């Protein structure tokens, strides 16, 4: 409607650094393709970027610029097809439907197996179907619905993500696609192979919830340390089993129950001793001594038995076992620290230049205004898209220089720790003051020269 | 102390649900294979044993109660197999897996989350106290700036930049 | 005590790694100083202030 | 205040230079 509003919408301003190292401002019309970028992809890129050793995220953004352009092209192509776009828009809804159906099937299986908001309405309908037809028919209907809904969800996922644009090898490489395929296979097995298979779909909950995923990460982040601690515990149990087999063989007596003798020697063979220890002592709070025969005070070896039990309890159980829990707690602390650091850097520094918010205070332009307008990353992405799109013959001075920089694989044109508004105004003021001082000095020198000329003329 | 738990209650509940899912899978495995060994002694008010795994739901309930309440795990209540039994190695493997996954790792996640919540609360309290007691409420200026100057930071807040003024 | 020892070891390792990878070995100058200058910090350590030299 | 003192000194120097130039012009005339 308003020409000025339309032109302002399509106009983007950026700050760049030339070879001379003097900052410059480029105002350009945003390419039409750039508008097609989805905001979900923008948020994912903003939150996913990882700073390099230099402390700048610009390299990853530049690398992902090409993928973003391809995503824009694929989004336009998808817009060309209303039905595929509509399916893509509802991918989350399909995923939720599939998860809810799997949960309902699992609940029914758990409640009645073996056999033979709208969510309350769905539950009532499921109960009515169970009563009218039975558990078998209702489970079959729910399984078929879940399989079809998950297939639709996967179709929408592949359509929306555009991962096929990367290539079929990329499709196979994407872990999420393989996980969805595995979910579909599990649903298929549940529908036909056996109902209990649907229980596996419960693991999908981990993918759905992020807090549970973080709790699991707390363990899997340092899984190698936990496994090594378990191996050390196994080695200690092996040594202790050797000691018991050599010396305490008799005391290894375990009560036994036989299906249609009440005790057995569970340490006849050193391997059997190791197995018995590794099972009972690890499962026993006191240790191996809990299951081993209780020695009387009269027994000569009773002090040795007490020493052995105390050593086992203090080493294998008290210390070694607690190492896994300590490692898990330390992993929790490390994850919390990393998350806090990442959030602070993201929300308190400029993405492009890395400048802190503290610098922009007490100045004409605030930090928020700086990021919103002066140093918007998407403006730089749009400039890159324009440079690629624009013909070389039509390249403007700064545009030609930036295209040459892109060809040279150099990111110097990206500003680093430099902002126009923060330093340029003060520098201009200082330069004006210095120029005034220089003009005064030049006037004084001219007056001195005139006086010298007058003196020379008088002498002559 | 209560906040330390309620602050991240969602994570604790999700960990409990994950433990329930693991117990459900393990109950499925036992019902399919280890159905016989699920024998529990019973006391009757005025048989001394019962099969607590006749139905998969009953197996799930029995595991979720006894194994979670048992330090060793489900294997503590399950019938003890003799070395002669063919399935004894399978029973030992099942018990070890249960103890190492459901009890050793998954259960400790709740305690780790509680400890991490304690640490987060302590850090937040320290940051808030430091900001309150070392910076100006109105202008946010630090106390370090006002030292070596005519007007001290305390005088600045008391008179120059009093919020109530 | 074991948990506190874990935390202390993690803190010491983080501090040592940060100092090693963000400061000059010879002069101790931080990487932040060399930015916005003709010679970068990495170039400084590689050529200007190489310990092996 | 320091900058104002410096500016006053510069203005006095400029006034002296202008007076010298005027005297030279008068002598030439
Ligand atoms: N260089 C940057 N540093 C930090 N945050 C940035 C930077 N560039 C953009 N952001 C933030 O990323 C998000 C993307 O901003 P964007 O300009 O896309 O906003 P928008 O409201 O979708 O756009 P518009 O209203 O101008 O059509 C916003 O939170 C913006 O503050
Ligand atoms: N801007 C500020 N920044 C930090 N602390 C402040 C600020 N303004 C007030 N305070 C503190 O808040 C409390 C309120 O101070 P206030 O002037 O009300 O003191 P008062 O002793 O009750 O008053 P009075 O003695 O002047 O009648 C004091 O601790 C004061 O130091
Ligand atoms: N003063 C220093 N501060 C920090 N790191 C340094 C310093 N001097 C050297 N390094 C690093 O220590 C390692 C040793 O560098 P060195 O010069 O030996 O490299 P090189 O590749 O083996 O040698 P060249 O390629 O020159 O034959 C490199 O990582 C270098 O960056
Ligand atoms: Zn910036
Ligand atoms: Zn103040
Ligand atoms: Zn150096």
Short mmCIF file of N, CA and C in Angstrom, two decimals, chain A residues 21 53-54 319 323 326-327 329-330 333-334 337 418, chain C residues 2-3 6-7 10 14 18 31 35-38 42:
data_model
loop_
_atom_site.label_atom_id
_atom_site.label_comp_id
_atom_site.label_asym_id
_atom_site.label_seq_id
_atom_site.Cartn_x
_atom_site.Cartn_y
_atom_site.Cartn_z
N UNK A 21 40.86 -1.95 5.71
CA UNK A 21 40.48 -2.11 7.11
C UNK A 21 39.59 -0.97 7.61
N UNK A 53 37.59 -21.67 17.96
CA UNK A 53 38.65 -21.27 18.88
C UNK A 53 38.80 -19.75 18.93
N UNK A 54 38.69 -19.09 17.77
CA UNK A 54 38.83 -17.64 17.73
C UNK A 54 37.72 -16.93 18.50
N UNK A 319 33.62 -47.45 48.03
CA UNK A 319 34.42 -46.52 47.25
C UNK A 319 34.17 -46.72 45.76
N UNK A 323 31.89 -44.37 42.71
CA UNK A 323 32.56 -43.60 41.67
C UNK A 323 31.64 -43.34 40.49
N UNK A 326 29.36 -40.53 41.49
CA UNK A 326 30.11 -39.29 41.47
C UNK A 326 30.36 -38.79 40.06
N UNK A 327 30.67 -39.71 39.14
CA UNK A 327 30.88 -39.34 37.75
C UNK A 327 29.60 -38.78 37.15
N UNK A 329 27.17 -37.26 38.77
CA UNK A 329 26.95 -35.93 39.33
C UNK A 329 27.87 -34.91 38.68
N UNK A 330 29.14 -35.28 38.48
CA UNK A 330 30.07 -34.36 37.83
C UNK A 330 29.64 -34.07 36.40
N UNK A 333 26.98 -31.49 36.55
CA UNK A 333 27.55 -30.17 36.79
C UNK A 333 28.18 -29.61 35.52
N UNK A 334 28.92 -30.45 34.78
CA UNK A 334 29.55 -29.99 33.55
C UNK A 334 28.51 -29.56 32.52
N UNK A 337 27.09 -26.20 33.54
CA UNK A 337 28.03 -25.12 33.27
C UNK A 337 28.08 -24.79 31.78
N UNK A 418 34.15 -4.85 16.03
CA UNK A 418 34.08 -3.50 15.49
C UNK A 418 32.63 -3.15 15.20
N UNK C 2 34.52 -37.50 48.03
CA UNK C 2 34.85 -37.98 46.69
C UNK C 2 34.23 -37.07 45.63
N UNK C 3 32.97 -36.68 45.83
CA UNK C 3 32.31 -35.79 44.87
C UNK C 3 33.01 -34.44 44.82
N UNK C 6 36.08 -34.76 42.83
CA UNK C 6 35.75 -34.74 41.41
C UNK C 6 35.58 -33.31 40.92
N UNK C 7 34.83 -32.50 41.67
CA UNK C 7 34.59 -31.12 41.27
C UNK C 7 35.90 -30.33 41.22
N UNK C 10 37.88 -31.32 38.15
CA UNK C 10 37.30 -30.74 36.94
C UNK C 10 37.65 -29.26 36.83
N UNK C 14 39.86 -27.59 33.84
CA UNK C 14 39.32 -26.52 33.01
C UNK C 14 40.22 -25.29 33.04
N UNK C 18 42.16 -23.82 29.78
CA UNK C 18 41.88 -22.46 29.34
C UNK C 18 43.16 -21.63 29.27
N UNK C 31 44.76 -13.91 24.29
CA UNK C 31 44.39 -13.84 22.87
C UNK C 31 43.54 -12.62 22.58
N UNK C 35 43.52 -9.43 18.97
CA UNK C 35 42.45 -9.19 18.01
C UNK C 35 42.35 -7.70 17.70
N UNK C 36 41.80 -7.41 16.52
CA UNK C 36 41.67 -6.04 16.02
C UNK C 36 43.04 -5.40 15.78
N UNK C 37 44.07 -6.23 15.57
CA UNK C 37 45.43 -5.76 15.34
C UNK C 37 45.98 -6.42 14.08
N UNK C 38 47.12 -5.91 13.62
CA UNK C 38 47.72 -6.43 12.39
C UNK C 38 48.10 -7.89 12.53
N UNK C 42 47.31 -16.20 17.09
CA UNK C 42 47.86 -17.45 16.58
C UNK C 42 49.16 -17.21 15.82
#
